[PDB]
Design a protein around this motif. Structure first.
Motif, short mmCIF file in Angstrom:
data_model
loop_
_atom_site.label_atom_id
_atom_site.label_comp_id
_atom_site.label_asym_id
_atom_site.label_seq_id
_atom_site.Cartn_x
_atom_site.Cartn_y
_atom_site.Cartn_z
N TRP B 35 0.81 -1.21 0.00
CA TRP B 35 0.00 0.00 0.00
C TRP B 35 0.85 1.27 0.00
O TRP B 35 1.93 1.30 0.58
CB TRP B 35 -0.88 0.04 1.24
CG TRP B 35 -1.93 -1.01 1.27
CD1 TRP B 35 -1.84 -2.25 1.85
CD2 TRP B 35 -3.24 -0.93 0.70
NE1 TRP B 35 -3.02 -2.93 1.69
CE2 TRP B 35 -3.90 -2.14 0.99
CE3 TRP B 35 -3.93 0.06 -0.02
CZ2 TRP B 35 -5.21 -2.40 0.57
CZ3 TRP B 35 -5.23 -0.19 -0.41
CH2 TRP B 35 -5.86 -1.41 -0.12
N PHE B 37 0.40 5.65 0.62
CA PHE B 37 -0.41 6.79 1.01
C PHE B 37 0.26 8.04 0.46
O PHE B 37 1.38 8.35 0.82
CB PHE B 37 -0.52 6.89 2.52
CG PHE B 37 -1.26 8.11 3.00
CD1 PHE B 37 -2.60 8.29 2.68
CD2 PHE B 37 -0.63 9.08 3.77
CE1 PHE B 37 -3.29 9.41 3.10
CE2 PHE B 37 -1.32 10.19 4.21
CZ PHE B 37 -2.65 10.37 3.88
N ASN B 38 -0.44 8.74 -0.44
CA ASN B 38 0.13 9.86 -1.18
C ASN B 38 1.51 9.51 -1.74
O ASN B 38 2.46 10.24 -1.54
CB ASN B 38 0.23 11.11 -0.28
CG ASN B 38 -1.13 11.62 0.19
OD1 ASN B 38 -2.17 11.40 -0.46
ND2 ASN B 38 -1.13 12.33 1.31
N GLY B 39 1.62 8.36 -2.40
CA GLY B 39 2.86 7.95 -3.04
C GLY B 39 3.96 7.39 -2.14
O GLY B 39 4.94 6.83 -2.63
N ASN B 78 -4.64 10.00 -0.82
CA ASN B 78 -4.64 9.05 -1.91
C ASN B 78 -4.10 7.69 -1.46
O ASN B 78 -2.93 7.57 -1.10
CB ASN B 78 -3.77 9.60 -3.04
CG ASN B 78 -4.02 8.90 -4.37
OD1 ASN B 78 -5.12 8.45 -4.65
ND2 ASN B 78 -2.99 8.82 -5.19
N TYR B 79 -4.94 6.65 -1.51
CA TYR B 79 -4.47 5.31 -1.18
C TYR B 79 -4.27 4.51 -2.44
O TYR B 79 -5.17 4.43 -3.27
CB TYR B 79 -5.42 4.62 -0.21
CG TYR B 79 -5.40 5.24 1.16
CD1 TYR B 79 -6.13 6.41 1.43
CD2 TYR B 79 -4.66 4.68 2.20
CE1 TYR B 79 -6.11 6.99 2.69
CE2 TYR B 79 -4.65 5.25 3.48
CZ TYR B 79 -5.36 6.41 3.72
OH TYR B 79 -5.34 6.97 4.99
N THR B 80 -3.08 3.93 -2.58
CA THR B 80 -2.74 3.06 -3.71
C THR B 80 -2.46 1.62 -3.25
O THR B 80 -1.70 1.40 -2.32
CB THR B 80 -1.48 3.57 -4.42
OG1 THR B 80 -1.74 4.84 -5.02
CG2 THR B 80 -1.02 2.59 -5.50
N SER B 91 -2.08 -2.00 -10.32
CA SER B 91 -2.10 -0.85 -9.46
C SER B 91 -3.47 -0.18 -9.50
O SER B 91 -4.13 -0.17 -10.53
CB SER B 91 -0.96 0.07 -9.89
OG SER B 91 -1.10 1.36 -9.40
N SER B 93 -5.76 3.21 -7.36
CA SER B 93 -5.75 4.33 -6.42
C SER B 93 -7.15 4.92 -6.26
O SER B 93 -7.89 5.07 -7.24
CB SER B 93 -4.83 5.44 -6.92
OG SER B 93 -3.47 5.13 -6.70
#
Lengths: 17, 102, 14
Positions: B35, B37-39, B78-80, B91, B93
């Motif tokens: 995961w 969070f904001n990259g 932003n969660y990726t 991927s 987001s």
């Protein structure tokens, strides 16, 4: 890369590796 | 052994006592996951961790949540979800908001 | 990575 941990209670620490 | 590329699917944040970012993941071989969070790489702690549902027999798909406990506006962002195996990368987001920002 | 799953989860690793 940087990383992030969430320790609860609004506490986010970033760590720069 | 049926080999195929890693895949993911991300759903909008839902509240279920704790907060959950629901997801599915699939692939053979079983993919690796991370995961962001904001990259930034998100380290799992007792307040944010991955939680899977027990998988049904005869199926390679895995379902779960990124579980957030007691988040606040700082966790808004932003969660990726990243997944990979030898046959492909995937991927996805979404934006999540848990509290209003002061 | 996984806070809950030191050995992964049914093949999936962090």
């Amino acid at each position: 890369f940087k990383s992030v941990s969430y320790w609860g209670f609004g506490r986010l620490s970033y760590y720069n590796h | 052994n049926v080999s195929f590329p890693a895949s993911v699917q991300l759903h909008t944040a839902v509240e279920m006592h704790h907060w959950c970012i629901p997801f599915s993941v699939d692939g053979q071989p079983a993919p690796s996951l991370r995961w962001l969070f904001n990259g930034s790489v998100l380290n799992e702690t007792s307040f944010i961790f991955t939680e899977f549902l027990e998988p049904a027999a005869n199926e390679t798909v895995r379902h779960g949540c990124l579980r957030l406990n007691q988040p606040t506006h700082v966790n808004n962002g932003n969660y990726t979800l990243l997944a990979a195996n030898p046959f492909g990368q995937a991927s996805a987001s979404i934006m999540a908001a848990f509290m209003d920002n002061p | 990575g996984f806070f809950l799953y030191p050995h992964g989860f049914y093949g999936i690793v962090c």
